[PDB]
Amino acid sequence: ELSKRDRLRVAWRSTFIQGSWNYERMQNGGWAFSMIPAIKKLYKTKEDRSSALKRHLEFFNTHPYIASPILGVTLALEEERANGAEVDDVAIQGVKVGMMGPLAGVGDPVFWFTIRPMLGALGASLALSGNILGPILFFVAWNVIRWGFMWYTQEFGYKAGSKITDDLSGGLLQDITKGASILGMFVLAALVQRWVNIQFAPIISKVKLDEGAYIDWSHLPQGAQGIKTALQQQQAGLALSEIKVTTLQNNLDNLIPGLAAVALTFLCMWLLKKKISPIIIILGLFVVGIVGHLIGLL
């Protein structure tokens, strides 16, 4: 009858939602593993155990932390369809697929690219100083927030589907989606610019400066005065060396910094839109990088 200390076990086993991760079917075995006590308590005499394993081993990929809503809605539906014979085998899958994309899109940026980076930076602030309280706080706060979120969302999903129709488009449960999307777009653009190194290394031109730019490092006063003259002339803006070495990176940076990064991100997005598997794309990035370094573009 789905006692409380059964959803305790279900939520604790949800910690192992991953582990059986596979390219063919993603997070299916882990999802089955997190539902095992629910099968154990409510079913009997083995005719429908196999059907349970079949209907809890299909494709299911979402953010690991925000997955307890599904794990609660499935219990809410199953505890009632057995006691009342309203078995569907298709609405329990329809709810799984309908809450697949949006929940992943509201959980991935918030947890991976919003809370993870800020908590890691805060922890490394004290950690880079040698203080253990940094990592201790990171660990404790992260665990508290994940466990609280999973428990609250699971017990909210335990509520029947009569409430999920209003608890899918708010109100408040839809505004959070838009806010998370905006915050994720901001942080993701920042990450794309800052942490995608496509630093080119060609050389465009080697032009010697006119006799009005270089410091003339052959006629300075000798000893404690030429030093000051050179420093003041550098602060004026005189070109350091005789040849103004120019790189394609410098020319590209004059439009927008990190143009190659955003161009590559858009190319990868377009490739993913063509149903290409990300593994092939990652191998393509590796091969293009190595052949570019061989040629000399990078």
Partner 1 sequence: MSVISIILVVLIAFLAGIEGILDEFQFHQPLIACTLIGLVTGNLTACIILGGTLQMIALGWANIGAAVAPDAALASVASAIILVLGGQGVAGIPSAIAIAIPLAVAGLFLTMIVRTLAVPIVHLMDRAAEKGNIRSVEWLHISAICMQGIRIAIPAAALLFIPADSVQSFLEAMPAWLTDGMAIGGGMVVAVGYALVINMMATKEVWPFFVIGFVVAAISQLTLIAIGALGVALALIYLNLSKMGGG
Q: What are the residues binding ligand MAN (CB under 6 A)? A: 26-27, 61-64, 104, 108
Name residue 54's beta-bridge partners.
Answer: none
- Looking at the Cβ atoms of 139 and 217, the one nearer to partner 1 is 139
Task: For residue 257, state whether it binds a copy of itself (rule: CB under 8 A).
Answer: no
- Choose the one of ligand MAN, partner 1, a copy of itself, none that binds residue 137, judging by a C-beta under 5 to 8 angstroms depending on kind: none
Task: For residue 26, state whether it binds partner 1 (rule: CB under 8 A).
Answer: yes
101 backbone dihedrals φ, ψ, rounded to 5°: -70, -55
Cα 212 from Cα 29, distance rounded (Å): 72
Cα 161 from Cα 95, distance rounded (Å): 9
Task: For residue 265, state whether it binds partner 1 (rule: CB under 8 A).
Answer: yes
Shortest distance, CB of residue 245 to a copy of itself, whole angstroms? 11
Shortest distance, CB of residue 259 to a copy of itself, whole angstroms? 9
Of the listed pieces 26-34, 72-80, 87-95, 230-238, which binds partner 1 according to CB under 8 A?
26-34
Size of the site for partner 1 (CB under 8 A): 119
Residue 123 burial by Cβ neighbours in a 10 Å radius (0-12, 13-18, 19+): buried
- Looking at the Cβ atoms of 100 and 220, the one nearer to partner 1 is 100
- Looking at the Cβ atoms of 227 and 285, the one nearer to partner 1 is 285
Shortest distance, CB of residue 227 to a copy of itself, whole angstroms? 6
Task: For residue 247, state whether it binds partner 1 (rule: CB under 8 A).
Answer: no
Task: For residue 222, state whether it binds a copy of itself (rule: CB under 8 A).
Answer: yes
Which residues touch 297 (CB under 8 Å, ≥6 apart)?
Answer: 200, 201, 202
- Choose the one of ligand MAN, a copy of itself, partner 1, none that binds residue 30, judging by a C-beta under 5 to 8 angstroms depending on kind: partner 1
Name residue 243's beta-bridge partners.
Answer: 208
Closest Cα partner for 96 from 120, 76, 74? 74
- Looking at the Cβ atoms of 62 and 154, the one nearer to ligand MAN is 62
Under DSSP, the state recorded for 115 is I
Instruction: Report the b/e string of 76-100 with b at 16+ CB within 10 A.
Output: bbbbeeeeeeeeeeeebeebbeebb
Task: For residue 207, state whether it binds a copy of itself (rule: CB under 8 A).
Answer: no
Cα 32 from Cα 55, distance rounded (Å): 9
Task: For residue 100, state whether it binds a copy of itself (rule: CB under 8 A).
Answer: no
Among 145, 151, 161, 193, binds partner 1 (CB under 8 A): 193
**Alpha helices, DSSP H only, in 56-132?**
68-81, 91-98, 101-108, 116-127
Of the listed pieces 1-9, 110-118, 158-166, 219-227, which binds partner 1 according to CB under 8 A?
110-118
- Choose the one of ligand MAN, a copy of itself, partner 1, none that binds residue 235, judging by a C-beta under 5 to 8 angstroms depending on kind: a copy of itself
Strand intervals (E) in the chain = 205-208, 243-246
Cα 61 from Cα 28, distance rounded (Å): 8
- Choose the one of ligand MAN, partner 1, a copy of itself, none that binds residue 165, judging by a C-beta under 5 to 8 angstroms depending on kind: none
